[PDB]
């Protein structure tokens, strides 16, 4: 029997797939059923081997539900199981999350030389914050200057400058320092003026600290009290650092710089000096999915570490805490020299008088080329920061350097010192054009060394195109003195008499006629020769991914080559516009550089977009990862229910209610469901009410946008969501204020229930309604009067005041005998027994309706209907107030109970983003219908197990018409029957996508079959030839490409019209994860998949739905399964993660959603002009968490593209 149970898991998970990420144990069996006679007969027969079938009825992951049927050889059922529920031995955790999904985070090849984000400029209020305190002092500032510096010496010499160590001179000079701003008539009145600022934003923390420290600097002025503890426990200095819109924007720029650096250099060993409380650590490390291999939280004092251990627990796996005195050598302090990729000095270099020596120490800890990010004071401005800065106990330690305090080093003098202490100078800066960023302007520098060389033979191939000719001439002119060879075409290279075998190649061929457009001209043998003679190579492509898919096929071939020949440096440079120089030489010399032990990375694949270089990196797309994993555990995401559909969904077991994402993900069916109105719900009824046998609908009230008019309306939704999409037939559009906020929804709900009760029964002459809401009682009486049905009211709390546990004799005595139907609306189940007794006393065969028959938590019209409903409601609106039982959706979800429904209760949906931005329980991408019933979905090459599973899932999710295509579509007709049982007509086309004639014949046969127009394509034809390019043959290249390349070309040409009446909802091309990283022996496959990727990208750029899924090893289904390659891929699992059949369905679903979203954003003028804008289209998948321990086995671990996907190392 336990093996029979294991059969459920087997149906749920295939061997080697790991869909069983947690140990499920049978927790709740709905119904076993055993035939003891047959079981004993089988046991005594001696065969002791019986057949079995099993359905994994529920598989979302939170708990598996299965039905088992074990039978004898004669097929007699010995025993069966129904909804056996295996629940995890322990609840699933984030550690059990499947991180297969990933996105091409496209980020700069180098941090911006000037962090100039407009969002982080000195806003007008800040440019009124600081200038107001300037106005206080601007009158005699030129005379105050020196005096101000004296005031700033309060740590070192102010108590000696005017004998201010004496309290009389204290009361004199401290107030004189404050008057260095308050002198021009403001005097003590400035205290009020300061408050006038503190009242609002952009000036609160800074000037508030000015007030709080100036009022108490007297003891500190004599060097007695603590300069900043004068306000208890750093009342606002942390607030000054974190919130001030003069200090704050510098920290935002620091986060931007750190994000760019960690993106370009992944798995950086990060050391933050001056972290202190961690405000800068919070800002920079808050970047989503930044590549930290190890974050060494650091400060001169260990006291903050505990707080860090509380603030940065999520990063504790990668984060380690160690103190560093920048004034002291780090190696003496235990830090490994030159063992850090990046260091972040957060406004702490001014706290050390050994600035140059501290920066030399930072160099000592940084690896060559490491990135130093400095937030520090610069370009002093007297009228803006004197008070608080002039106090601290070590900020003036540094006047030994020569200027006031540790000088407000200008970025020029910063560059001078930084170069002197062994760095590359000021590589980046923060926009400091006007003001307010001088105290914290951030700078980025490299730990310069032998470093880049801004010798091996160089060979240029291409240059045929006029732009290619120009770029070849520019290469010749700009290249340093090197041996040079030149060839117009790669075929000419094949004709070359002599080539150097350690050559560095620069290939402009892709700018010219592409290799993959003319492989039949021996260009493939020429490529073999190029690989043989090449030790380094750089290819140049002209917008390969968005305009030239053949160039992208070349990119994929070279991507796989980089794996096949690791000694062969491979680089690709994709330029959105070739006419827009000087960088291909840089990348070639970079390839000549092979500093493996230094921070600088290879840059395997660069893209020149918008006049700047960028690189892609695979980062776990936490959005779709969360969507997939929500199927298995309660994943919560910060969602704005005001603008995003959020449904107050009941639990599967109806345990309680929770907010979940209700996103329909752009289902295009709004024609048969004509004019589906979008209602932004303000108030709703938690429970769905049955409506004249049409079904159960949640009564909702809220706005509808009509010409930007927020017209109030009341409707019968089907999801109970902040935002609903409901047909107009279920909407009452009048903006009647009598149907007040919440109250009106309550009354309309009550009348929906009452009209349901009157209608479903109407036939009867008298009915009884038990324990209805008082409003419900009055409205039921009104409805009975209008319809002429004698309605009696009974309440267990005029009404027939019954009582729970009443005797049947008492009910006979009191209950009227004319009743023909009973309507039990008692939300509390205690009355249930009473109801049963009523069935004994009332008329025999009396119709019975429970609260579940009129109110429910699951849903899965004449205008006269709502007209009558509102008319009846208007008969009794004054019965109660507007907010009778109003509660916020959050409160209801937190405290509501399905078993105890609260009828006549109204959820108040928040409408402001701040009010509505809530932790919402993420919903699976395929939880809702994703496909239209009036369209054919064409799965090309998807006739195998993978394609058949995808098709059955499609029909399970709205695809009523599916067309599997294959040159040999071996599918059982009975399987078509089975999928028809699911509610969709599935057919096999026998279409060979390699030939235009075959594709046209198949598409015409679709019309012959009278199928709807093709609304989507799932292009996954596959032919594999595991062979090395040097050992590969051009026939193999064509064999693997044409099914992919020519197939996508033919289908795109057939569906390249965006103005057609039936544009494809999606064009999903099944790419392999090798397309994103390469794979030895599969450069053919990777090039084909990259052609697919580029066709999808350029098709989206053309205004047509498309996307690609870079699938890993599909164990449950696909060639890996029929060929029995599960063990082979498991042996290389650390390289390619397992994608389950249903996880593959989820990936395809998210790709379809991405295509539809891209199309809609194009309706919102998203251009997708470059590769940087189409990361969402390519759903990277199948890359497991890369364990550094397996770095040796992982042939691509050295590739920075996967940098964010690496596991902690220590």
């Amino acid at each position: 029997l336990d093996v029979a149970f294991q059969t459920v898991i087997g149906a749920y998970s295939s061997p080697g797939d790991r869909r069983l990420r947690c140990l499920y144990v049978p927790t709740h069996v709905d119904r076993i059923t055993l035939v003891p006679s047959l079981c004993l007969a089988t046991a005594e027969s001696g065969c002791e081997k019986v057949a079995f079938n099993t359905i994994n009825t529920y598989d979302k992951g939170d708990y598996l539900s299965g039905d088992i049927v074990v039978f004898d050889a004669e097929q007699t059922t010995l025993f069966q199981v129904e909804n056996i529920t295996f629940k995890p031995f322990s609840p699933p955790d984030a550690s059990t999350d499947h991180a297969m999904f990933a996105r091409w985070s496209w980020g700069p090849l180098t941090p911006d030389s000037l962090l100039d984000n407009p969002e982080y400029w000195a806003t007008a209020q800040d440019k009124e914050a600081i200038p107001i305190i300037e106005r206080i002092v601007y009158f005699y500032i030129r005379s105050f200057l020196s005096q101000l510096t004296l005031e700033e010496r309060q740590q070192a010499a102010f108590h000696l400058q005017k004998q201010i160590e004496w309290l009389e001179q204290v009361l004199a000079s401290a107030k004189e320092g404050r008057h260095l701003w308050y002198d021009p008539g403001w005097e003590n009145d400035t205290e009020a003026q300061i408050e006038h600022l503190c009242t609002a934003n952009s000036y609160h923390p800074h000037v508030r600290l000015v007030q709080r420290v100036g009022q108490h600097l007297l003891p500190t002025v004599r060097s007695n009290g603590n300069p900043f503890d004068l306000l208890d426990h750093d009342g606002l200095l942390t607030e000054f650092y974190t919130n001030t819109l003069s200090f704050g924007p510098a920290l935002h720029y620091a986060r931007e710089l750190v994000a760019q650096i960690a993106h370009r250099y992944q798995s950086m060993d990060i050391l933050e000096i001056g972290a202190g409380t961690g405000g800068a650590t919070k800002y920079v490390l808050a970047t989503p999915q930044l590549g930290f291999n190890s974050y060494t939280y650091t400060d001169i004092s260990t006291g903050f570490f505990e707080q860090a251990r509380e603030q940065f627990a999520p990063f504790e796996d990668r984060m380690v805490f160690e103190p560093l005195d920048i004034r002291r050598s780090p190696a003496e302090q235990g830090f490994e020299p030159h063992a850090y990729d990046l260091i972040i000095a957060s406004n702490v270099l001014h706290a050390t008088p050994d600035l140059e020596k501290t920066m030399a120490h930072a160099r000592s800890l940084l690896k060559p080329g490491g990135q130093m990010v400095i937030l520090e004071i610069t370009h002093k401005e007297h009228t803006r920061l004197g008070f608080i800065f002039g106090l601290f106990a070590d900020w003036w330690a540094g006047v030994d350097d020569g200027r006031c305090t540790e000088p407000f080093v200008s970025f020029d003098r910063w560059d001078a010192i930084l170069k002197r202490v062994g760095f590359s100078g000021v590589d980046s800066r923060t926009t400091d054009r006007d003001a307010n960023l001088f105290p914290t302007s951030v700078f980025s520098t490299h730990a310069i060394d032998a470093t880049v060389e801004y010798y091996p033979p160089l060979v240029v191939v291409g240059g045929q195109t006029p732009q290619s000719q120009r770029l070849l001439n520019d290469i010749k002119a700009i290249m340093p003195p090197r041996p040079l060879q030149t060839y117009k075409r790669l075929v000419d290279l094949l004709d070359a008499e002599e080539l150097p075998m350690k050559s560095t190649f620069v290939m402009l061929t892709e700018l010219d006629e592409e290799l993959f457009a003319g492989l039949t001209e021996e260009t493939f043998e020429a490529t073999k020769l190029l690989l043989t003679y090449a030790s380094n190579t750089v290819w140049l492509t002209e917008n390969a991914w968005v305009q030239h898919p053949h160039q992208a096929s070349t990119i994929g071939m070279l991507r796989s080559i980089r794996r096949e020949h690791p000694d062969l440096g491979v680089h690709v440079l994709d330029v959105d516009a070739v006419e827009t120089v000087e960088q291909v030489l840089r990348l070639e010399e970079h390839t000549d550089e092979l500093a493996s032990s230094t921070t600088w990375t290879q840059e395997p694949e660069v893209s020149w977009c918008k006049g700047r270089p960028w690189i892609p990196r695979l980062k776990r797309d936490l959005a779709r990862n969360n969507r997939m994993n929500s199927s298995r555990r309660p994943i919560y995401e910060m969602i704005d229910s005001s603008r995003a559909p959020v449904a107050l969904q009941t639990a599967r077991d109806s345990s309680s209610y929770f907010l979940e994402s209700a996103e329909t993900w752009f289902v295009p069916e709004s024609v048969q469901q004509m004019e589906t109105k979008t209602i932004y719900v303000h108030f709703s009824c938690p429970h769905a009410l049955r409506v004249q046998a049409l079904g159960f609908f949640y009564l909702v009230q809220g706005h509808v946008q009509e010409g930007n008019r927020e017209v109030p309306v009341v409707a019968l939704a089907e999801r109970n969501a902040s935002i609903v999409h409901v047909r107009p037939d279920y909407i009452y559009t009048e903006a009647d204020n009598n149907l007040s906020e919440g109250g009106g929804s309550l009354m309309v709900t009550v009348l929906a229930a009452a009209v349901l009760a009157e209608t479903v029964i109407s036939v009867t002459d008298s009915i009884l309604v038990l324990n209805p809401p008082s409003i419900c009682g009055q409205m039921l009486l009104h409805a009975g009067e209008e319809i002429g049905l004698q309605v009696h009211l009974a309440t267990t709390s005029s009404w027939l005041t019954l009582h729970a546990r009443d005797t049947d004799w008492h009910l006979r005595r009191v209950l009227p005998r004319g009743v023909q139907a009973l309507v039990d609306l008692s939300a509390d189940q205690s009355c249930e027994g009473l109801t049963q007794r009523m069935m004994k006393v009332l008329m025999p065969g009396c119709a019975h309706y429970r609260a579940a028959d009129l109110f429910t938590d699951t849903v899965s019209l004449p205008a006269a209907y709502w007209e009558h409903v509102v008319s009846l409601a208007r008969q009794g609106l004054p019965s109660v107030s507007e907010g009778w039982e109003v509660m916020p959706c959050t409160q209801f979800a937190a405290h509501a109970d399905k078993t105890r429904p609260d009828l006549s209760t109204v959820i108040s949906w928040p409408r402001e983003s701040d009010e509505a931005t809530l932790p919402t329980r993420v919903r699976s991408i395929d939880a809702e219908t994703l496909f239209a019933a009036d369209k054919t979905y064409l799965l090309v090459g998807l006739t195998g197990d993978l394609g058949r599973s995808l098709g059955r899932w499609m029909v399970q999710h709205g695809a009523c018409h599916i067309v599997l295509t294959s040159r040999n579509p071996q599918v059982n007709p009975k399987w078509l029957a089975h999928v028809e049982e699911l509610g969709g007509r599935v057919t096999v086309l026998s279409m060979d996508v390699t030939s235009q004639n075959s594709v046209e014949a198949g598409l015409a046969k679709l019309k012959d079959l009278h199928l709807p127009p093709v609304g989507g394509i799932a292009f996954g034809p596959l032919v594999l030839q595991d062979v090395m390019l040097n050992n590969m043959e051009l026939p193999m290249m064509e064999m693997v490409l044409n099914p992919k390349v020519e197939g996508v070309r033919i289908l795109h040409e057939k569906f390249s019209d965006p103005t057609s009446s039936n544009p494809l909802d999606f064009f999903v091309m099944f790419s392999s994860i090798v397309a994103v990283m390469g794979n030895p022996g599969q450069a053919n496959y990777s090039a084909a998949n990259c052609y697919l990727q580029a066709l999808a990208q350029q098709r989206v750029a053309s205004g047509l739905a498309a996307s690609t899924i870079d699938i890993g090893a599909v164990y449950g289904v696909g060639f890996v399964t029929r060929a029995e390659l599960e063990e082979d891929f498991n042996a290389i699992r650390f390289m390619f993660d397992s994608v389950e059949e249903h996880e593959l369905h989820t990936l395809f679903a998210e790709a379809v959603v991405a295509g539809r979203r891209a199309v809609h954003q194009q309706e919102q003028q998203r251009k997708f002009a470059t590769v940087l804008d189409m990361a969402d289209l390519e759903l990277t998948t199948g890359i497991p968490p890369l364990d550094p321990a397996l770095k040796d086995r992982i042939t691509f671990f050295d590739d920075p593209r996967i940098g964010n996907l690496k596991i902690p190392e220590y």
Partner: protein
């Protein structure tokens, strides 16, 4: 011809602890004084 039996397998891992509930359910016995189940589905067609 029926017998409904509420059953509870209580469990105690060690004599130190109290007796706890390991499993529970009901039993419905179709009995006599001394093809009863649906035939299995049609051996689901294609299964790796």
């Amino acid at each position: 011809g029926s017998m409904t039996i509420s059953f509870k397998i209580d469990s105690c891992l060690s004599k130190e602890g109290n007796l706890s509930l390991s499993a529970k359910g009901q039993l419905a016995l179709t009995i006599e004084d001394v093809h009863h189940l649906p035939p299995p589905e049609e051996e689901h067609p294609h299964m790796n």
